[PDB]
């Protein structure tokens, strides 16, 4: 869920990007 | 609701069967404003309910609603500090509401994995007089029959 | 941690004291208030009095603690439990 | 402990700003500080002239500073001496083109900041607070206004128990926006501490 930085929903929740939510 | 009694919201009839009772039932399926997902669940079961038991889906739905409407229920009244169980006749507005509410809840208590199947089977079992929602209706009707001694406190 | 594009950070005014010791044939007690200094292989063998807000705390420097910071070995709060 | 400020409530409606200019997010604070720094000096000096308002207008490296006042005398000076002596010191802080003006106050007893200052000054002289209030209200109504109310709050007469006392005549409808109500505050220091005077003058509805 939103608390797991290692997923897309987590990256959305903290407003960050990475391998699990890139641009 | 002191001043005037509230007005009953009229619902936009559904875009398939054109039936308000269908729209009301989908609203009881809906959680967190996902009416799209909600209406999608209800219609998928209508498919299931036409496959299994080839009756008309809308016809099965309404009869299941009829088999779950309770005609009597217990309420609370005073006469001193006492708290009576008073048997009351259920209004048509409330018969429909309790019937719809117990159906979704009974459906979601079922063990089928996906939501439409739970609603399909519950609407099937209800239209034949079985299911948790019917057991809930009969249960309510019983408690008003037992406390029929205090029926003279009704209003 | 600190970007390695930058340097391994030492306040210089402490690294100064360390290097003059190595040249002159150490040891000597080293009193610093720079907890933020990074321990560095030139510090191995010495004892450094690290300030913790109240006292200069001696810290003998060993090889296995080289990569750390100075304040890590001068704890800043006294606790010894409840009850 | 509840009522809202009567001017700021009506800004853009019945009351207009005391600083009229545009700026951008780059130097808005620098100019606004200048207004305050300028307006600081003026109220300090022109107090003895009964300063009832300071208007500021700006274009670029120049400023208005229109000073309303009950007695233009202490402003202008001898043939325009004080008006120069201050305008000199003025741009000595502004570093700009500071064109001081002096507008007369039609009726001073129809100005709220003046009525408050006359009461604040009267009670510093140890005058009967309850009386000074009724008189001030009496003057403002004799001056034709449609309503007046005056509030003094603190250790009246120097009592240990603080108190609030007020008087009013006619009508003062603070909830009404189209009602022109001039508001003004004056603070009176005494041997025993600070008192606070609120003046409300109701001119009319527009």
């Amino acid at each position: 869920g939103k608390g797991d930085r290692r997923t897309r929903r987590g990256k959305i929740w903290r407003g960050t990007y990475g391998k699990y939510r890139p641009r | 609701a002191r001043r005037r009694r509230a007005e009953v919201r009229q619902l936009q009839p559904d875009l398939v069967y054109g039936d308000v009772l269908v729209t009301a039932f989908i609203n009881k399926i809906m959680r967190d404003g996902k009416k799209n997902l909600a209406a999608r669940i209800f219609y998928d079961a209508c498919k299931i309910i036409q496959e299994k038991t080839g009756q008309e889906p809308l016809k099965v739905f309404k009869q299941a609603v009829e088999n779950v409407k309770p005609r009597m229920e217990v309420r609370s009244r005073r006469v001193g500090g006492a708290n009576y169980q008073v048997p009351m006749e259920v209004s048509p507005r409330r018969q429909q509401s309790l019937a719809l509410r117990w159906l979704v809840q009974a459906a979601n208590q079922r063990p089928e994995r996906r939501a439409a199947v739970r609603i399909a089977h519950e609407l099937m079992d209800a239209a034949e007089g079985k299911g948790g929602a019917v057991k809930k209706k009969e249960d309510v009707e019983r408690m008003a029959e037992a406390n029929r001694a205090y029926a003279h406190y009704r209003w | 941690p600190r970007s390695l594009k930058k340097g391994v950070f030492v306040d210089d005014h402490l690294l100064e004291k360390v290097l003059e010791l190595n040249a002159k044939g150490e040891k000597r007690l080293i009193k610093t208030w720079s907890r933020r200094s990074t321990i560095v292989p030139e510090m191995v063998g010495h004892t450094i009095a690290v300030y913790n807000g109240k006292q200069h705390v001696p810290v003998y420097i060993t090889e296995n603690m080289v990569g750390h910071k100075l304040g890590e070995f001068a704890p800043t709060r006294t606790y010894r439990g409840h009850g | 402990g509840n009522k809202i400020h009567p001017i700021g409530f009506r800004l853009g409606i019945t009351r207009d700003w005391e600083s009229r200019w545009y700026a951008g997010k780059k130097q808005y604070r620098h100019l606004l500080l200048e207004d305050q720094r300028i307006r600081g000096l003026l109220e300090k000096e022109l107090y003895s002239a009964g300063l009832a308002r300071v208007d500021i207008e700006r274009a670029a490296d120049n400023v208005a500073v229109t000073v309303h006042v009950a007695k233009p005398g202490v402003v202008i000076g001898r043939g325009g001496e004080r008006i120069r002596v201050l305008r000199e010191e003025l741009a000595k802080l502004t570093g700009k083109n500071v064109a001081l003006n002096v507008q007369e106050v039609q009726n001073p007893n129809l100005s709220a900041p003046l009525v408050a200052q006359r009461v604040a000054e009267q009670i510093e002289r140890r005058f009967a607070v309850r009386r000074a209030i009724k008189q001030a209200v009496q003057r403002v109504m004799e001056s034709g206004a449609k309503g007046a109310k005056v509030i003094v709050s603190g250790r009246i007469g120097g009592a240990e128990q603080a108190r609030t006392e007020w008087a009013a005549q006619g009508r003062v409808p603070l909830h009404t926006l189209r009602a022109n109500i001039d508001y003004g505050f004056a603070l009176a220091r005494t041997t025993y501490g600070v008192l606070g005077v609120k003046a409300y003058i109701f001119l009319g509805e527009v």
Partner: protein, 60 residues
Amino acid sequence: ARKALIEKAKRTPKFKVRAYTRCVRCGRARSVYRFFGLCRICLRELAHKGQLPGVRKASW
């Protein structure tokens, strides 16, 4: 620790981090708007006073 602190804030600091905002009017180190250079309290006092150009009470 007030006047010495309202003066030390104006001073140029040994590092650009030690610089902090400070209300030009009263001296608050907290709730200081960059736009006005004021604090939330003085901002309210001058707004009600009309000494802030164009600013007014918003309502919607």
